[PDB]
Design a protein around this nucleic acid. Structure first.
Ligand code: CL
Ligand code: CL
Ligand code: CL
Ligand code: CL
Ligand code: K
Ligand code: MG
Ligand code: MG
Ligand code: MG
Ligand code: MG
Ligand code: MG
Ligand code: MG
Ligand code: MG
Ligand code: MG
Ligand code: MG
Ligand code: MG
Ligand code: MG
Ligand code: MG
Ligand code: MG
Ligand code: MG
Ligand code: MG
Ligand code: MG
Ligand code: MG
Ligand code: MG
Ligand code: NA
Ligand code: NA
Ligand code: NA
Ligand code: NA
Ligand code: NA
Ligand code: NA
Ligand code: NA
Ligand code: NA
Ligand code: NA
Ligand code: NA
Ligand code: NA
Lengths: 56, 194, 237, 92
RNA sequence: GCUUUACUGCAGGCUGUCGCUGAGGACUCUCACUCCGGGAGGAGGACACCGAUAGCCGGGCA
RNA sequence: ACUCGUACGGUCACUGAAUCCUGCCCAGUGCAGGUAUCUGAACACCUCGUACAAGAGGACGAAGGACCUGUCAACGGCGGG
RNA sequence: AAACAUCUCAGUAUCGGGAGGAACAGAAAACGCAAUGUGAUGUCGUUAGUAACCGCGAGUGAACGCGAUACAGCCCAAACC
């Protein structure tokens, strides 16, 4: 079975959804964790220094 | 004449001799069965405590913390590393056990601030330290001309920023002359070379 | 290279775990205050999914209902006893001291009260040889002479289900069904049939182990494969 | 080759010819307290030790003469250029 | 990426030593400590575990 | 984790239904056992050195190695004259 | 470093914890232009690419002092009550 187009047909599973805390469609309803703000994993807000250039 | 306190001090100079030696052998048995952080009504080394700032007063807390002995509990590298950085066994943390003890106690009492701490011995694998914490919100402390300084907002979370007793010594701030070039005023300001 | 299969095992992932939730009971000798008075009646005989051997359901006098590691010859209605003064019949459990030497025994405790550790698989049994006030010498199924505290409890008789190993599996499918009831990864790909990256015997233009198969006791995991600290190999001599 | 144990020759100390005695330089024992010794201890740590992880060079097919010429009257010795010699045996 | 008796190191295993650790080149005991027991108590015991260090093995890994 | 498991177990490998069979080799390499003697680190101990210290040397000697033995359905070998 | 292992990139990137409006440091068990001398602490200029480190390779790299800025000095533990 082709890994491309033919394998795209079984994709009717809902995972990432609108997050209660940040509003982004990143709340993974299976994991109950937002990949954008960290809701469900961290009280503190998700954020990293690599999200911007080193000297900025 | 000699203070009664001077006798507690004298005994602790050699914790493996005389009566104290036997107390320890007794005590540790119960300590080893106790938790990581245990609040105690009275300081095991009263002279030590009073000397550090302890007072039989409201808002003053003492707690004994257990910490494992030894070097860094380190995970081996999972990617490329030059030989110099492949190390595991001999690496040791830059923060001493007493300091770890102070932080663990402090986290257990989020509202209190660490005043100071001292050692109360060790066995083959634990090290025990008693930490003196203070309630900066309790009047009685707010009204004490000797401890009120710790109530200032600038002192929130002293231990975590190395403003503690053991914190400052462990940071190399002991000496005011030779040897403290990369230490004072801070390790970070000196590029982290001490 | 990559971690070898024996290393994937230790992580305890689904593939390597036993289907515990599907198991029936943790066969252990009952605890008796003392006196031995404790007796019960066999209410049924069931299949043990964790041992491919039968097991017995027992109702004890004090209301307790527990499955038991069943020796051969136990049936519904029988009355089993557990205690120092228990009669000496198959199916009963008592300390090696109260057991007459020369009697076959099973589900022997390693240390008094641990509930039984030795001789529990299909049709096996231990052999109580010597007594004493200090040591009870038992011969385990492997043939070893084990010195045990005479206070260690045991069950009279040989474990039920003897002869299971006598029948060949005949086909892959039958192994399959059994393997599905154990904490094991099956089937087994030979190391020499793998790539160098996957196993110390992997690689090569043809199939053969790279070095000799006998590996030192001190070899680290990832390398300890083949014949571990073999004192000898082959059949000759 | 052969070489006389004693012979007349210039003594740079006496500043005049005198009988000298020839001897092969016996190696002196190390004290282990030189700077290089302290640097080895100091600088060796986890991983490769740089220069201190190196091992003993090798050998030239023939070594040069390594001798001491000792004045027979003032007792002071001096050193000279050596020359390649597969073997050096003294006469008497 | 892979290999190995390439170079150099790093995990891991084995082993001595020190600390925990106590009483009277082989020995007893019990009090720490470990395990078994619901408890009473039983087994083991200054060893083991753990911390430190030393020697050997060490493409398992860099 | 294996394991609600306990040698009729389960781990680690090789070969690959049945049938007839599976010879010779333990020197090398590997594993394992033994070991008078030899070698074998550090601590403690002894000697020299230093009013101390660095350092040099000795005594003792674990695992390991030398040495001996077992082992090929262990890596493998089975020629020239 | 014309490869590379110590070294270098660098205590940098990145990660964990936490404060404030600024942090941190701070009234000598200091300095050691050795003195009949200086006098808490930051910071700026300089000292100086000096001393020191280093397959003594490539590289790395202070401080005292001085001229400035701003200046500030105190509280416990104990003795005796
Ligand atoms: Cl704090
Ligand atoms: Cl099976
Ligand atoms: Cl010569
Ligand atoms: Cl000055
Ligand atoms: K590098
Ligand atoms: Mg794909
Ligand atoms: Mg600053
Ligand atoms: Mg069970
Ligand atoms: Mg079979
Ligand atoms: Mg069938
Ligand atoms: Mg399965
Ligand atoms: Mg297969
Ligand atoms: Mg293939
Ligand atoms: Mg490999
Ligand atoms: Mg084949
Ligand atoms: Mg083959
Ligand atoms: Mg090194
Ligand atoms: Mg337990
Ligand atoms: Mg490699
Ligand atoms: Mg380069
Ligand atoms: Mg170069
Ligand atoms: Mg640097
Ligand atoms: Mg200076
Ligand atoms: Na706190
Ligand atoms: Na430093
Ligand atoms: Na192979
Ligand atoms: Na150094
Ligand atoms: Na590649
Ligand atoms: Na051979
Ligand atoms: Na052999
Ligand atoms: Na280059
Ligand atoms: Na290159
Ligand atoms: Na260097
Ligand atoms: Na001047």
């Amino acid at each position: 079975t082709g890994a491309g187009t033919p394998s795209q047909g079984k994709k009717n599973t809902t995972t990432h959804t609108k997050c209660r805390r940040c509003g982004e469609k990143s709340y993974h309803t299976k994991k109950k964790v937002c990949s954008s703000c960290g809701f469900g994993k961290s009280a503190k807000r998700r954020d990293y220094e690599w999200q911007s250039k080193a000297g900025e | 004449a000699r203070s009664a306190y001077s006798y507690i001090r004298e005994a602790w100079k050699r914790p493996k001799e005389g009566q104290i030696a036997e107390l320890m052998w007794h005590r540790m048995q119960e300590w080893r069965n106790e938790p990581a952080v245990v609040r105690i009504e009275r300081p095991t080394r009263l002279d030590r405590a009073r000397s550090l700032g302890y007072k039989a007063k409201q808002g003053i807390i003492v707690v004994r913390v257990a910490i494992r002995k030894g070097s860094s509990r380190r995970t081996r590298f999972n990617k490329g590393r030059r030989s110099k950085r492949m190390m595991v066994n001999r690496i040791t943390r830059k923060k001493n056990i007493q300091r770890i003890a102070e932080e663990r106690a402090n986290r257990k009492f989020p509202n209190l601030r660490v005043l100071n701490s001292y050692s109360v011995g060790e066995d083959g694998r634990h090290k025990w330290h008693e930490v003196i914490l203070i309630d900066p919100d309790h009047p009685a402390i707010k009204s004490d001309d000797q401890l009120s300084w710790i109530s200032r907002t600038r002192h929130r979370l002293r231990t975590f920023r190395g403003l503690t007793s053991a914190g400052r010594r462990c940071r190399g701030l002991r000496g005011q002359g030779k040897g403290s070039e990369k230490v004072r005023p801070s390790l970070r300001v000196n590029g982290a070379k001490a | 290279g990559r971690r070898i299969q024996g290393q994937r095992r230790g992580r305890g992932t689904s593939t390597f775990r036993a289907p515990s939730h599907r198991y029936k009971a943790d066969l252990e000798h009952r605890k008796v205050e003392d006196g031995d008075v404790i007796a019960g009646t066999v209410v049924d005989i069931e299949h043990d999914p964790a041992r491919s051997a039968p097991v017995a359901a027992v109702e004890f006098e004090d209301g307790d209902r527990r499955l038991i590691l069943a020796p051969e010859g136990v049936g519904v209605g029988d009355e089993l006893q557990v205690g120092v003064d228990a009669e000496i019949a198959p199916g009963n459990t008592l300390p090696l001291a109260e057991i007459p030497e020369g009697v076959p025994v099973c589900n022997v405790e390693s240390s008094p009260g641990d509930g039984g550790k030795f001789a529990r698989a299909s049709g096996v049994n231990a052999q109580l040889l010597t007594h004493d006030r200090n040591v009870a010498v038992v011969k385990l199924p492997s043939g070893e002479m084990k010195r045990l505290d005479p206070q260690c409890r045991a069950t009279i008789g040989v474990v039920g289900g003897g002869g299971r190993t006598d029948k060949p599996f005949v086909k892959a499918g039958n192994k399959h069904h059994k393997m599905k009831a154990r904490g094991t990864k099956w089937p087994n790909v030979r190391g020499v049939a793998m790539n160098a990256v996957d196993h110390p015997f992997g690689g090569g233009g043809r199939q053969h182990p790279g070095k000799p198969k006998s590996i030192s006791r001190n070899a680290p995991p990832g390398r300890k494969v083949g014949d571990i600290a073999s004192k000898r190999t082959g059949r000759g001599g | 080759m052969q070489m006389p144990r004693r012979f007349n020759t210039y003594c740079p100390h006496c500043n005049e010819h005198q009988e000298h005695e020839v001897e092969k330089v016996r190696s002196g024992r190390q004290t282990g307290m030189k700077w290089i010794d302290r640097q080895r201890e100091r600088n060796s740590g986890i991983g490769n030790d740089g220069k201190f992880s190196k091992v003993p060079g090798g050998d030239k097919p023939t070594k040069k003469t390594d001798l001491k010429y000792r004045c027979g009257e003032c007792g002071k010795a001096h050193l000279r250029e050596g020359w390649r010699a597969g073997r050096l045996e003294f006469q008497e």
